[PDB]
Amino acid sequence: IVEGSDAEIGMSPWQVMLFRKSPQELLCGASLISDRWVLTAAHCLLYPPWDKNFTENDLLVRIGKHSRTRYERNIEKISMLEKIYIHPRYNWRENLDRDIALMKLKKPVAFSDYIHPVCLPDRETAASLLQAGYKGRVTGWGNLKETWGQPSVLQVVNLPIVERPVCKDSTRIRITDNMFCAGYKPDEGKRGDACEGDSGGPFVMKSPFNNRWYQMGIVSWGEGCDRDGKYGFYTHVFRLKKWIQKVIDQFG
Amino acid sequence: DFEEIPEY
Amino acid sequence: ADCGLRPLFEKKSLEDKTERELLESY
Ligand SMILES: NCCCN1CCN(C(=O)[C@H](CCCN=C(N)N)NS(=O)(=O)c2cccc(C(F)(F)F)c2)CC1
Structure with missing residues (x-):
């Protein structure tokens, strides 16, 4: 992370x-x-x-x-x-x-x-929570930097879901409905992203309706780690x- | 490196 | 179920340090 x-x-x-x-x-x-x-x-x-x-x-x-x-x-x-x-x-x-x-x-x-x-999302969970702007949490013991080191303890970071058009325009790779991307924009100031070793980990959100944590995504891929203009892509669990x-x- | 694990 | 309710947090009605950030975004 x-x-x-x-x-x-x-x-x-x-x-x-x-x-x-x-x-x-x-x-x-x-x-x-x-x-x-x-x-x-x-x-x-x-x-x-x-x-x-x-x-x-x-x-x-x-x-x-x-x-x-x-x-x-x-x-x-x-x-x-x-x-x-x-x-x-x-x-x-x-x-x-x-x-x-x-x-x-x-x-x-x-x-x-x-x-x-952790809970798995149902149709309504996905609809209300998987919206651009809404933040989820990613965790892992992966690298602290794309290139340097490594954490002594589990790392955590909260990242906002990104609008689909912005996700698509950030890469040459073909994005599908089975993926969503998250992370801050260059002009948002804040940073953070998953990195090598974090793959396969969960992207979770806490429902404000029943206060339960749901895994909405799986750390899937990205071009580098925490690069400006790039975003992390996640497997759409639902x-x-x-x-x-x-x-x-x-x-x- | 990692600390060695047991029986597993 | 009991899924998604953390023993050291939700179960004891304690909040972690950045939970609020998620809530404020919803
Ligand atoms: N582990 C199986 C072999 C390679 N995997 C492929 C996926 N992968 C990666 O995507 C890594 C690390 C970023 C990790 N953080 C995020 N945002 N998820 N980035 S990457 O080094 O730029 C990369 C390597 C190989 C393929 C891809 C592609 F699938 F996108 F085409 C990308 C890590 C290495």
Whole structure:
């Protein structure tokens, strides 16, 4: 996260760290949506251009973390993966359209003060909250700068959803209805954005109607990190909820 | 680098 | 469900330090 701040303890209890077994390193962010399901970006698991094709046995899921590098003994919980499900129409060949994936844990994780699931949006949630100007929150243990370092603790930053025309005019890449972008404009002064390592993490919003946190997006892609005139792009969670439900009530 | 983890 | 209600915040009616910024934007 660039231009963000240290998260408070238990501020994002649904935050998940996708950890590579060997070499031991952070590979992506993710989120907890139930006691056995974790949501992330498909590009975190599959990206042929860079020879990335992780299998269930290559990763671990670390939940309830705050520190990036330390093993938080009596607090975090490390889970093994049973199966990975990538969206059938994930477009890694072009623009990362439908950049979404689900991971089923081998055993249900026990919730605690530091481990708790986030809600997924329904049609009405999306309609009222996904509007230009409305701010969401992005979290992760990714890089602090596009090029320099790395955080000792989970980082957080609030960013406003950007008008679709502005998102499209900021890039040469084809934007789809399954993506939305967020971030401050050059003339807004404020800054912030996700960066390498934050991929797959959640973009959440707190409903003013029922005061619950909803994951509206997944950190998907961007051109560089926190560059003026550029914006971070996120997977539109509600637009792909049908797929999410299909996989859950099929192998759940 | 990261701190080593156990049994997992 | 109980989703989206944080044990150390919503459940105890405590607010985090930047929650307000989101609310003011809605
Ligand atoms: N992890 C799988 C392999 C590459 N992935 C692709 C996605 N990706 C990225 O988009 C990174 C880092 C920005 C992170 N923050 C935001 N705004 N989400 N930016 S990027 O380095 O400019 C980039 C690299 C490769 C492809 C893309 C494209 F998909 F946009 F075409 C971009 C990180 C690396």
